[PDB]
A paper describes a structure:
Enteroviruses particles are composed of single-strand RNA (virion RNA) genomes encapsulated by an icosahedral capsid of ~30 nm in diameter. In this study, we genetically perturb this equilibrium in a non-enveloped virus, enterovirus A71 to determine its structural basis. We isolate a single-point mutation variant with increased particle thermotolerance and decreased efficiency of cell entry. Using cryo-electron microscopy and molecular dynamics simulations, we determine that the thermostable native particles have acquired an expanded conformation that results in a significant increase in protein dynamics.
To understand how structural changes during the uncoating process are altered by the K162E mutation, purified capsid of WT and K162E were examined by cryogenic electron microscopy (cryo-EM). The native state of the WT particle was refined to a resolution of 3.3 Å using the gold-standard Fourier shell correlation cutoff of 0.143. The reconstructed WT particle had a high degree of cross-correlation (score of 0.883) when compared to the previously reported EV-A71 native structure (EMDB ID: 20766). We observed classic “jelly-roll” beta-barrels formed by VP1, VP2, and VP3. Within that structure, we observed electron density corresponding to tightly packed lipid moiety, known as “pocket factor”. The pocket factor in the WT particle interacts directly with the VP1 beta-barrel. Lysine 162 in VP1, well resolved in the density map, does not appear to interact with nearby residues. Instead, the positively charged side chain is exposed at the surface of the particle, near the exit site of the pocket factor. The exit site of the pocket factor is near K162, but the pocket-factor and K162 do not directly interact. A side view of the WT structure reveals a tight interaction of the extended VP4 with the internal surface of the capsomer and the external surface of the RNA (VP4 in yellow and RNA in orange).
Author numbering:
A (entry chain A): 51 to 149
B (entry chain A): 1 to 297
C (entry chain A): 150 to 198
D (entry chain C), E (entry chain C): 1 to 242
F (entry chain C): 1 to 49
G (entry chain C): 147 to 194
H (entry chain B): 10 to 254
I (entry chain D), J (entry chain D): 12 to 69
Amino acid sequence: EIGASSNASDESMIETRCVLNSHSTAETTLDSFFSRAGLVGEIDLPLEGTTNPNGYANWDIDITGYAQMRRKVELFTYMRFDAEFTFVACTPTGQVVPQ
Amino acid sequence: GDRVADVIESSIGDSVSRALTRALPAPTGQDTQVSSHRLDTGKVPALQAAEIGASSNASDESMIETRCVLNSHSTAETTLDSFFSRAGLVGEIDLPLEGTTNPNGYANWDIDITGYAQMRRKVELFTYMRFDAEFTFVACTPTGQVVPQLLQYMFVPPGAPKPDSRESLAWQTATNPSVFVKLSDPPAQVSVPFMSPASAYQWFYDGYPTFGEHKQEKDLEYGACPNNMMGTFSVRTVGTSKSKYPLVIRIYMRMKHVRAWIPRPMRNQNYLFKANPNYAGNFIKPTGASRTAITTL
Amino acid sequence: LLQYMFVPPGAPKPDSRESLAWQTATNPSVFVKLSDPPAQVSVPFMSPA
Amino acid sequence: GFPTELKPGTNQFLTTDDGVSAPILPNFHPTPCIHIPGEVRNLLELCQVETILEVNNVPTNATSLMERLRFPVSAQAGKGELCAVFRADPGRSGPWQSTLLGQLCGYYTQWSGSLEVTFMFTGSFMATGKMLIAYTPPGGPLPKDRATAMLGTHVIWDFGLQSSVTLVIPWISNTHYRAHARDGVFDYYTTGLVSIWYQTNYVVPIGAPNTAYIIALAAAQKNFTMKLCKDASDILQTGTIQ
Amino acid sequence: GFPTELKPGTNQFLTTDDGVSAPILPNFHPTPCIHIPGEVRNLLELCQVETILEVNNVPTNATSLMERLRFPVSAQAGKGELCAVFRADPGRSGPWQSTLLGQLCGYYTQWSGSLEVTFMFTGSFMATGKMLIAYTPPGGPLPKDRATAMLGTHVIWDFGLQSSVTLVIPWISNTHYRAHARDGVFDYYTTGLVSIWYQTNYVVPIGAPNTAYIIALAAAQKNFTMKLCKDASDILQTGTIQ
Amino acid sequence: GFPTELKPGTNQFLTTDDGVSAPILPNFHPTPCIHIPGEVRNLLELCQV
Amino acid sequence: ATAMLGTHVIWDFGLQSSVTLVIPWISNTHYRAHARDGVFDYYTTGLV
Amino acid sequence: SDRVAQLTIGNSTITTQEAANIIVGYGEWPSYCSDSDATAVDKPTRPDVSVNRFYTLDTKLWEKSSKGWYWKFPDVLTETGVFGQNAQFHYLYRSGFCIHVQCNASKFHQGALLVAVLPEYVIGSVAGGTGTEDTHPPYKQTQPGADGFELQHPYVLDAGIPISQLTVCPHQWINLRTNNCATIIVPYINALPFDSALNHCNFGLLVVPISPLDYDQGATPVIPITITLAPMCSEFAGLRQAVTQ
Amino acid sequence: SHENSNSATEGSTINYTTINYYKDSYAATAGKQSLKQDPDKFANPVKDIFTEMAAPLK
Amino acid sequence: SHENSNSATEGSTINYTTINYYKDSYAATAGKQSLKQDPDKFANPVKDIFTEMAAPLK
Ligand SMILES: CCCCCCCCCCCCC/C=C/[C@H](O)[C@H](N)CO
Ligand SMILES: CCCCCCCCCCCCC/C=C/[C@H](O)[C@H](N)CO
């Protein structure tokens, strides 16, 4: 009712033994959870098409276009961070071309 | 409190593991000391009893007249890391253009090193092994030619969504670690930690993972250790359309920081199934070669 | 893409391009492409003498 | 002309690799950080906050999706009947998916630590009663009756001024960590079952409602840890987000 | 812009090369290691454990593969006849392939150190006798008789309360190491021959079995070392492991 | 991500270049050297015979 | 299989001809009255 | 001073006059789980004398044509006494063992038994002989119970592993000419501090006659092999209702 | 090592270990965070804190 | 050199010499192990150890 999580411990409910917990909590930190590159935008540069037939495309920077990234980032209201952007370019067949 | 003698003097709770032996440094092979002819009664090093189950401790000096040899032969190369830290084939992924296995341009490889006898016989020598891993992915066409194709290797831990198509949403890799390399580049190489829930990988699990009746349909669960299911390996050709080239991907694993427990007899029969000690019942062959007679070579 | 395997005396000699000996689970192997610079390794003094 | 030799692993793009990248804007100083309350530093802080546990996750229609949050109790025949059961796995599909703890554990393959479940009684002040909440360690099937259920870890809940009671699910496992359990061979990592039985009855006087609802809140203790960060099990996206 | 010059050997994948690789899971801490008994630290520990030596490796059929482990002795004519012979090479095809020492030495090109072979007598308690076990250093052919065999290293075995005797095969070689010997020019690294001759007879009283079996256990001494780790001589695989 | 710039002379194989190469056999210790008479140390020793 | 569950000894024939089986004092009361058929079997010592 | 021995634990005592010393598995005595190794938070129960006692489970007859037998641990005791009751009522399990194999004969009998303890002894099937059939051993073969199971191909131990290398495991030899008993003390061997006593079998005990039994006609033809064993430092945790299998 | 103090976490009470090769601190690696947690600041954010073993409502 | 202590052989009595360029210790090289052996713990694991030159069975 108060709105506070119950503070009852294991020792105060059942007969417990002595366990030295050495399990690290490092991997649940913010940088460990978030510092993994994920898709945030995709740019298509077709030869003949209606989207970008001019050989260029302007992508308004926003990470809300893909649910995988959006669900993670949207967990918190305010986020302050640096960014590292990697651009993987290839033809639709996955082939690399001298462009 | 404790007032009765059987509780006060009780050894219950003594968690120290009494070890009759202690490890001693041995950088080189043991030296051979001078020995002379020895003619005495009552004391006899030659006669032993393998009945006890202990290896005979008779030395060279106690059997024949030996000289003094300073043995400087190093024992470094027989250590666990020296023996195991050599990359070997553990899995092969085929990505055909037209086929029945993986015609969709992607393939999910359940991570297991039991698919190749060369690696399996080495790793299966010990019951429990704890180590890091270093995986190298050599990709090429069936003719051995390198082609300008961009691939994605995804590590899919147990419980993560397995991709079902080359354009599946799971490839967004927002949380899973992924590697993007081209075939023209050197083979991709990453280091994988010890991810088992147990304190050590166990190649043989003499038990069942879940309770209940183990009928015919629920019979493949024997010998399967969930503590060794490290996840799935997903590879795809990065693109929306079908790839121009057929690809075959070979995955080489090299253990490091290896620790091993409980040595067991080395396999002597042909392997038949992954994660299964089954052997050809009618084709049981002897461990070594045979000879016509025991009195001749 | 080529594979160079060092086969010490006593190790099984491969008999075909798809032989099981190429699994190199113990033997040292080098995987290089012709476009890459020539493969270069250092070999110790391995003679019994 | 310093001699270097490229080793395998070059030219690759590893998404989890922590490396250095060229800064696009030299000499750029970001906006100074003012103090904002409620800063998180570890996801374990969020994993220790109680959230509503959808124990009664039977309904599916939109007009009654709200009743999944709580399950009812009422006057009974006093034979120790069963009220509700649910598995104790947080990252497994089921009731625990409604909790923030379960949602976060969906991002981590392995978890270790004792969980805590608090049930809030929302009945009238004049309604009393006792309920038995029992946790069955792994290996034992669903208890057939209260006499079988009492043999495991359990708590006796007495309705009173203190509306809620806390049931601690102790960390009882053979392995240091539990991988995510599911149907098949991976049920080896099951945590067990939590069953709620009527201890005596739900006693209510004349003039008060005959049916009362219980709200279950689930959270993790201070020894709870997570390992092997993995991809999300659910992708909240059907096509392209337009 | 640090000037570097790539030297030959780049872009290659050396399977035995010890290098650094990018960690897939940052900040991941593995499961803590509990104490497990029987940890190995060096393969020499396994090479010093006695294992059954298939001296009588004549049979091939499945129903009698078990009799390869032991070879028989019986009452004889007392002329010092020959009982069994076998080569002392551990990594060579033959009896030594049944031993863990031989199986491990199959993984190493060069070995150096004295070997030890213990024969366990499994006859009746009332049966006595003496046997001569002689080791012939390299260069000498198979001895034609006991008089020739005694000239090399040998031990006289007396049956008694101590069932087994230990024959030490001393390290006698011109080279510091022996490469794996086989038929052809590589027989230069032969270790020699071990032959077992009846010293006096196998004497047994009335009412006890006339034929008794001997179990041979082989192992390596504390000066045994191995070098030049190589690929396995046998590949336990016919097709693809399905 | 240490910035390096390749200078001319890369990818070449110089036969007289003294460089480091990856060892094929890790932790391998060669056979110990016994004393052998008549060791040469410089070709000038042979040029004076 | 049922008998082994109580106090027991394993006797090996050898040079030592005899073995000693100790019947420990296991009783609820400090003393045992003389047991016999009927209600007085309450003081039974057990079976060997 | 080494041939006569007496092992006492709990309320049971086992004696022997032709012993052949005692083998401690991997040179480590059984011990209770340390607080830095334990992972369960509930306080384990340590019944002590009620479970740490010598259980005589079954008797097998050694014959001139016997192939060998094996038992699974603690399967053999999952249904025996207070130990079995505790193993059924408790989810977790931890204990050592002291296995005493009895096989007594006369001075005119001959034969040799290899008594070994192989941890995680996974039994495989014959795969239909040719090896094209993906079979699995039945429940009665993977968990034989207190009756053990007779090996079909003792040369490969029904698992593709030669018995010639079985001596690398803690083992003793029962050679009827000298000794009539084998004593092996096995600590807890697992990758986990605790495990289920029903689903998981920590190790399997193998009794395979390497040298066939022989005797002239007229002597006692029944040579029984009796297995006697006693858990050491047994712990249990995770109590719930009893589970039979 | 004189670089710009322009990382996203500058002016904080916590120390990181990062690798950087440029004058701008925001180009550095992610590094290691401090393992400090404040679970109570969400779990029990009450004005008058109450004892565990006692009655929450008195 | 402040890195994570997450190698597979951490908390051991033996010292390794490894080369690492990342904050995770399991990415390091294999390095050199200590040449410690315990041959007796398999070869002669008896309770009452017996002298070499004496009679094993007395
Ligand atoms: C090569 C230059 C790349 C420049 C990268 C700049 C990225 C800056 C990081 C944050 C970008 C904003 C992410 C989206 C924020 C909000 O969710 C949306 N604006 C919603 O309106
Ligand atoms: C790029 C990501 C690669 C991830 C590599 C993870 C490998 C983890 C190492 C151990 C893998 C398990 C090996 C096989 C274990 C057992 O033998 C089988 N599971 C038998 O069931």
